[PDB]
Tab-separated table of C-alpha atoms and ligand atoms in Angstrom:
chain	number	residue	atom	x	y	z
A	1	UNK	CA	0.000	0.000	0.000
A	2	UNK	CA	1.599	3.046	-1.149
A	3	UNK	CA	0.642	6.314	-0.340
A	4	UNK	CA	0.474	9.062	-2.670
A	5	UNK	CA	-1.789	11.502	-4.887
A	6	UNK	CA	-2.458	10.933	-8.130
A	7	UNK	CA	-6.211	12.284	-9.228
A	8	UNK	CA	-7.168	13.004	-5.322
A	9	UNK	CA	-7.957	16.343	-6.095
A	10	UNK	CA	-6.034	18.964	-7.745
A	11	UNK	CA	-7.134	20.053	-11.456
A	12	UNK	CA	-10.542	19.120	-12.030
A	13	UNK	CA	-11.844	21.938	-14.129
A	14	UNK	CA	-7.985	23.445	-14.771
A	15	UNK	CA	-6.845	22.772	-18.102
A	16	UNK	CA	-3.922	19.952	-18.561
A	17	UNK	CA	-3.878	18.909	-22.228
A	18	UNK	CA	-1.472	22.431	-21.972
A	19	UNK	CA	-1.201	23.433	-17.800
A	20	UNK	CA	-3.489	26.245	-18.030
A	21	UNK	CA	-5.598	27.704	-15.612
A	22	UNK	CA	-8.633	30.638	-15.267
A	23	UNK	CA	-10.483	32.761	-13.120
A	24	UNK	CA	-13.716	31.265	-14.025
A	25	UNK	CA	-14.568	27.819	-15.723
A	26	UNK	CA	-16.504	30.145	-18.325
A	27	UNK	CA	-13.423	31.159	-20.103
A	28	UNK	CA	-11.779	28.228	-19.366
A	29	UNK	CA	-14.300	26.429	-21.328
A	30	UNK	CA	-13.941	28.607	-24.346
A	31	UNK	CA	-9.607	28.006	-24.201
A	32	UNK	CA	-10.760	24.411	-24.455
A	33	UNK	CA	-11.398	25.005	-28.400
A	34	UNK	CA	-7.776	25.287	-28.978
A	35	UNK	CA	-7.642	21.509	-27.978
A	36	UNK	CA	-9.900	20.922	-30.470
A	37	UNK	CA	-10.245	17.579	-32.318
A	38	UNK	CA	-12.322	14.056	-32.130
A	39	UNK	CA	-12.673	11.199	-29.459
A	40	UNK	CA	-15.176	8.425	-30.499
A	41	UNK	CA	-16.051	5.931	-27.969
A	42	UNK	CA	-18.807	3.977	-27.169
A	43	UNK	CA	-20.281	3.217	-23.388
A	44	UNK	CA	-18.218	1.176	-21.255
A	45	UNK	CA	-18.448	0.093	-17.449
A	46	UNK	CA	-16.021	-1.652	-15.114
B	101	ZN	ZN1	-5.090	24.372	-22.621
């Protein structure tokens, strides 16, 4: 049992395709466009 932090809490909303953060999710959401591109995938649980 080790014990560190991996996704524990940290950047949930924060951007990290780049490392970027904002003030307010609202802009971040629009900075998300320069990460544009597609990600097809159908459900899956377990
Ligand atoms: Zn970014």
């Amino acid at each position: 049992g080790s014990s560190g932090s991996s996704g524990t809490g940290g950047k949930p909303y924060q951007c990290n395709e780049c490392g970027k953060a904002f003030s307010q999710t609202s802009k971040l959401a629009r900075h998300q466009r320069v990460h544009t591109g597609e990600k097809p995938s159908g459900p899956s649980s377990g």
